[PDB]
Amino acid sequence: MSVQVGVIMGSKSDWSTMKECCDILDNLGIGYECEVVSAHRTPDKMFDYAETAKERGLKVIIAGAGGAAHLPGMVAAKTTLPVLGVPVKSSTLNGQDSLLSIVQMPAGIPVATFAIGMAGAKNAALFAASILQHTDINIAKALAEFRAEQTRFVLENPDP
Amino acid sequence: VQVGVIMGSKSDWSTMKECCDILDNLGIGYECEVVSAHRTPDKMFDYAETAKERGLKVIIAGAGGAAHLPGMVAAKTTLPVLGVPVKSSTLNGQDSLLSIVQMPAGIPVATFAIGMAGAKNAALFAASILQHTDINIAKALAEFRAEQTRFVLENPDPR
Amino acid sequence: VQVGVIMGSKSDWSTMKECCDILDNLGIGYECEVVSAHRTPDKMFDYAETAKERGLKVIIAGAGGAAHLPGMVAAKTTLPVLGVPVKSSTLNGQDSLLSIVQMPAGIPVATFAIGMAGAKNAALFAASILQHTDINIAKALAEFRAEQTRFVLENPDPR
Amino acid sequence: SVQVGVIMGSKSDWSTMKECCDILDNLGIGYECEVVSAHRTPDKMFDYAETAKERGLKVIIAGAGGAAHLPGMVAAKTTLPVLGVPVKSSTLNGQDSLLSIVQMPAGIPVATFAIGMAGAKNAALFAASILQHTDINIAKALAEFRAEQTRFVLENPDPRE
Amino acid sequence: SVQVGVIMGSKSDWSTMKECCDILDNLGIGYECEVVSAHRTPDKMFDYAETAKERGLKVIIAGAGGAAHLPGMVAAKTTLPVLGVPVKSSTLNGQDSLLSIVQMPAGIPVATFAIGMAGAKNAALFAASILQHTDINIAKALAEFRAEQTRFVLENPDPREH
Amino acid sequence: SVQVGVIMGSKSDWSTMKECCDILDNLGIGYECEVVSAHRTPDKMFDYAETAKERGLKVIIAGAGGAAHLPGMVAAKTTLPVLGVPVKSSTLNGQDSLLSIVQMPAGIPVATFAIGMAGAKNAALFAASILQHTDINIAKALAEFRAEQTRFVLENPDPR
Amino acid sequence: SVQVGVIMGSKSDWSTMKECCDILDNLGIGYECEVVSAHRTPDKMFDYAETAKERGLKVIIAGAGGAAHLPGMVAAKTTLPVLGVPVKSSTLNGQDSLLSIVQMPAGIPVATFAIGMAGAKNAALFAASILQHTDINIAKALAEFRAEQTRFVLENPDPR
Amino acid sequence: SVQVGVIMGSKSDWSTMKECCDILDNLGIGYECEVVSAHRTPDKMFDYAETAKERGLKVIIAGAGGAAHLPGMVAAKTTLPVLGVPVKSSTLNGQDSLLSIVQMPAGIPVATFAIGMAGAKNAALFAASILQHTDINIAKALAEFRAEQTRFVLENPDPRE
Ligand SMILES: O=C(CO)[C@H](O)[C@@H](O)[C@@H](O)COP(=O)(O)O
Ligand SMILES: O=C(CO)[C@H](O)[C@@H](O)[C@@H](O)COP(=O)(O)O
Ligand SMILES: [Cl-]
After folding, report:
1. So what does this thing catalyse (chains F, G) (predicted)?
2. Is the C-beta atom of C128 inside 6 A of ligand 2?
């Protein structure tokens, strides 16, 4: 698969959330790369990643971070590509800090924000597919089939 | 007409007008409509079912309180849906924000800041989806960002 | 079958089972079913539409996170809908609660406690609705209350 | 006939609770409205709840703010359905009242609506939905209300008007 | 002699409320402890509150969680000072308990303490500070409790101790 | 004869704490009211607390907002009952004030009342409930105030 | 001599940050103030942080609201102490600003003060306490500021 | 030479504040660690803050939880910089700790860091940034600490294994 989505995260500890993103991208046939890019510890690398993403052929960036979560916003500041933000569940405040740090962007620089934790990691991937589908038949198909199968799974198991 | 801007009531217009203003400035075609998830549920379903074949590429949906409009629209279209939490009078949009962003795995809504900020940013995010296949939008967005940057650099000492 | 007990997903069963248990204890006919607002939106609309003609008098709906199921069922039936916020793993049901209870004026949802307490109480409130027309349910509910009172008066010493 | 009791802790709740009464007025439902304080008139409170059923009330709608105990205590003392409206406190924007009403432990339910006027209105509309089952006038009036709110959106689609 | 009434909505509050009683014991203060539910035994709760003063009680400590109404409804039915302990609720970690107790409007006070066992302990120590004014031995015991807690920290300054 | 000390961290707390003092005046209870800052006058605050019992005070009522330390630090320096009134902060509507006062660890209690003027009123009424035991005049005036407020609601049942 | 850089995300933050500047003036501390937007002028922000030490700045005070990333991103790019002032957001009363600034994971600290003008004033006062070691005039001026504020409460005990 | 005083309200804070001291050790900064309770040892508290400067301290790092008053009260009684660490509380996950420390009114500042271990570590690292001007060895050690944390991310980009 050609490499269309960049999945980045603040530290290695985030993997247990962001893998669930990568797993879905994999299931949908979507080419991606994943990298640890810290906004606070590797600020220059973060700018360089953001700046070059479009000319490296990426179409969407999914960024995950926790606590004072700046990674998605600062990446969005340095690329015109759509940036999707995953608030990672923080051990002290259960991701309330993550969520507000990402979602409350003032006007001018957007970050599309999804649910705290794994659910938003999964949804970021599916939203990335809904971006890439307009341009890519197999990804359009794969997303259609995912939705059809999740719908079937609930229709087939009505008795709890 | 590539963007559908919708909201639960006319009371949301003071917020969503700002979304529309940015789409105009960027030369992006849009329609704007009151579509209530609770009071016009059948029209909400129809709207969402037919958006793609009507040629819409993104839907931007605002709602406050128990804000169900974005999520229910996303349930019924594969187009990307952008959720704007409208500031509630009682809880300052905290209800709006959680009701929109906390979608469980399977049906995503891209959520932006509470109020006017999220409205603008939704228009600007839709621009970044649409630039990929239209160079007039790429020009217009580049320029928008160029100008907002220039604006800040022109006024450095606030005294 | 007078009470429809529904939920967004199977994971909600550990909560919603306690609702059904109460209805059993009180001799109230019910059905329980997984109906997803986001994954089976058409089925949902259908369930809500046909509920009255199928004989249901009340619908009890549980959901967690961005909890849209009760509001949307309420939008599509004239029957009273009771909302149970299910405890979400990240925000302890704060999101579920606000997503259910903060309905704007026009379409109500009667909301109960987050978690098991709300599930049990939904079932009891449905009994309080249905007692008006059936003496056996009135007796059952009066007995349940008497039992819970006796349980505390007879066990006054925590030591 | 007087089928719904609308009660509240204090007259300062009236600006919220009046919106509940105006909706019952419009649906042609008979009600009484009354200040009954859980904290300042606890005995009258118990009395009101105790006698509601014999007085012919079918539903009680109770509003309060702060440490809002009125809905839960009435519910403790009557088998009638009680609806709880969290009144917007000046300090925490009704978050205290919401939790105080909605977080009832298993055994004594209170049907809880939205903080403030939205909940007040919805409380009334929800009382209509309980009462409709045995009052054709009420079934009619509630269907006309929902038809109207639906029509109003369909006929005014363009917010730029 | 029985001067403090310790009450709570349910037996599941005992793991918290037991800590209150332990302190009352240590300070030599007479008390009774009883489950009295505002929602399931509202009439017994009125009865308890009503009769407290004429039964010789001087303070009531009430614990409850969730939509915690016990402390405030007791306070509405007695002239005695009532101390409220918010019990840590499973769902909202006692945030519901705390607001349902402390946010009483003007007219009927409930002195409120910290969520959970910290508040249970402090409710007892606070009742001791009410009673000390007319009870010499309780004054003595409270002085000594405070002296001993100060000494414990003075004797253990180095957190690396092992 | 002065039995209640009413203190507060700054003059701006007066619009709240005046309501405490006004109830004390109506119940016939002697008090003094003083600006005592935990952060700007810590030595005076220690001294006030240390000498309160000696000066004849039976109860201290302390208001503060924000990072509200006055009630708790006074309680640390007297064995008298200390009543805390969280004053409504401009930024967080008294949430910071409430948590700063009520969440005392075991060992040093502060009796905490509602945020703002309702808490100020109730601290006074609660001080009365402590003082009534040893003073029949305070017991009578408190009893009347409750009978008054009950009768007012009872006599005005129609809110219109 | 310019030792403190006072920066803010936008002109609208000046209503808050002016109070910081006013206290620096009173303390006789040289400072500069500049609008530096993390999200709209990211390159300028990296340059400001990078060049601060060589320009002779000793402390940076950064104000921001919403998803407030300015203080954290400046701190990532300079080893100077960075003080963060959460600006009161119109929507969430600065709760988002506060969590966005204070919740920095281990590695890159930001010293955080109160939401709003309280924090703006205290950041100035705290910058003075860092600088006082290095300058006897700043040390005396801080000493006096405190002496005055203390005296002001001792001389004015009656709140009525 | 002891330049930083690390204090805490009780022994149950050590699991957090130990992480602050570890970092001071790694940076070669002299410090002392002490249990000083604002509520149980208020006099010792005042004396500790009073004498800080004359005993050679340049910065105080104070940790506390719940109604966390230690950091603010020490700042009211010394002219030295005080750093505040919110200790995670069992009931409210350090939300009380944070607000009790950070929301200091104008006049007496406390520099506040993240709730818990993250904040304890960052207190240490912020203290080092105050003191680096003073000792070229401390500036070297802080510069190296940062380099090391950056290297760990730049050299380990793929989180997969
Ligand atoms: O003081 C607190 C917590 O001690 C907060 O003000 C509460 O309001 C919080 O529990 C949120 O509640 P909801 O958002 O669930 O209503
Ligand atoms: O996300 C929510 C919704 O429940 C809140 O708005 C946060 O603000 C909360 O985490 C409180 O934060 P503090 O009270 O710790 O500032
Ligand atoms: Cl920023």
Report:
1. 5-carboxyamino-1-(5-phospho-D-ribosyl)imidazole + H(+) = 5-amino-1-(5-phospho-D-ribosyl)imidazole-4-carboxylate
2. no
CA dist list (Å): B16 to A113, B9, B64, C99: 18, 10, 12, 21
Give the integer Cα–Cα distance in Å for G33 and F86.
36
What is the CA angle A141-A146-A149, rounded to 5? 120
- Structure token digits, residue F122: 């109730």
Q: Which two tokens stand for residue G2?
A: 């310019």
Q: Which residues contact residue E162 at a Cβ distance below 8 angstroms, ignoring those fewer than 6 apart?
A: none
Q: 3-state DSSP helix/strand/coil percent for chain E, to nearest 5?
A: 50, 15, 35
Phi and psi, residue D140, nearest 5°: -60, -50
Class for the domain spanning A2-160? alpha beta
How many residues can be counted in chain A?
160
Q: Domain B1-159 belongs to what architecture? A: 3-Layer(aba) Sandwich (3.40)
Q: Mutate which of H40, H45, H47, H61 to test chain E, going by most E C-beta atoms within 10 A?
A: H40
Neighbours of ion ligand 3 (CB under 5 A): G 9, 38, 64, 68-70
Tokens of G28: 């006789």
Say if CB D105 and CB E39 are below 8 A apart.
Answer: yes
Which among A13, A104, A111, A116 is the top mutation candidate for probing chain G, defined by the most G β-carbons within 10 Å of its own β-carbon?
A104
What class is the F1-160 domain?
alpha beta
Do H75 and H104 touch, CB atoms closer than 8 A?
A: yes
CATH 3.40.50.1970 corresponds to the domain E1-162: yes
Q: Show the tokens assigned to G112.
A: 């955080």
Assigned CATH for H1-161 = 3.40.50.1970
| Secondary structure of A3-62 in HEC code, one letter for each residue | EEEEEEECCHHHHHHHHHHHHHHHHCCCEEEEEECCCCCCHHHHHHHHHHCHHHCCCEEE
The one-letter amino acid code at B132 reads H
DSSP H106: T
**Resolution in angstrom units:** 2.0
Q: Which long-range contacts (CB under 8 A, 24 or more apart) does A51-58 make?
A: A51/A78, A51/A79, A53/A6, A53/A79, A53/A81, A54/A79, A54/A80, A54/A81, A56/A3, A57/A2, A57/A3, A57/A4, A58/A3, A58/A4, A58/A5, A58/A6
* Residue D93 zone, left/alpha/beta (φ > 0; ψ -120 to 50; rest): left
Helix (H) or strand (E) holding F88: none
Residue F61's φ and ψ, nearest 5 degrees, are -115, 120
Chain C residues 92-131 within an 8 A CB cutoff of chain B = 94-95, 98-104, 106-107, 109
Give the span between the Cα atoms of F40 and G152, in whole angstroms: 9
Residue A93: count other Cβ atoms within 10 Å of its Cβ.
23
Interface contact A80, partner B, CB < 8 A: yes
Sign (positive or negative) of CA dihedral F127, F129, F132, F133? negative
Q: Count of residues for chain F? A: 160
φ/ψ (deg, to 5) at G105: -65, 165
Q: Identify whether the C-beta of residue A68 lies closer than 8 Å to the C-beta of residue G72.
A: yes
What is the Cα–Cα distance from B37 to B109, expressed in whole angstroms?
A: 15
Nearest Cα to Cα of residue E39 among B15, D100, B121? D100
Spacing, Cα D64 to ligand 2 middle (Å): 24
Four-point Cα dihedral E116, E117, E122, E128, nearest 10:
130
User: What Cα–Cα distance (Å) separates residue B45 from each residue in B40, B59, B69, B79, G55?
Assistant: 9, 13, 10, 14, 61
Q: Are G7 and G69 in contact (CB under 8 A)?
A: no
Neighbours of B158 (CB within 10 A): 19
- First-residue to last-residue Cα distance in chain H: 45
Tokens of F36: 């005592």
Q: Where in chain A are the domains? A: 2-160
Tokens representing residue F90 in the block: 């401009």
DSSP H helical segments within E11-162, as ranges? 14-26, 42-51, 70-75, 95-102, 117-131, 136-155
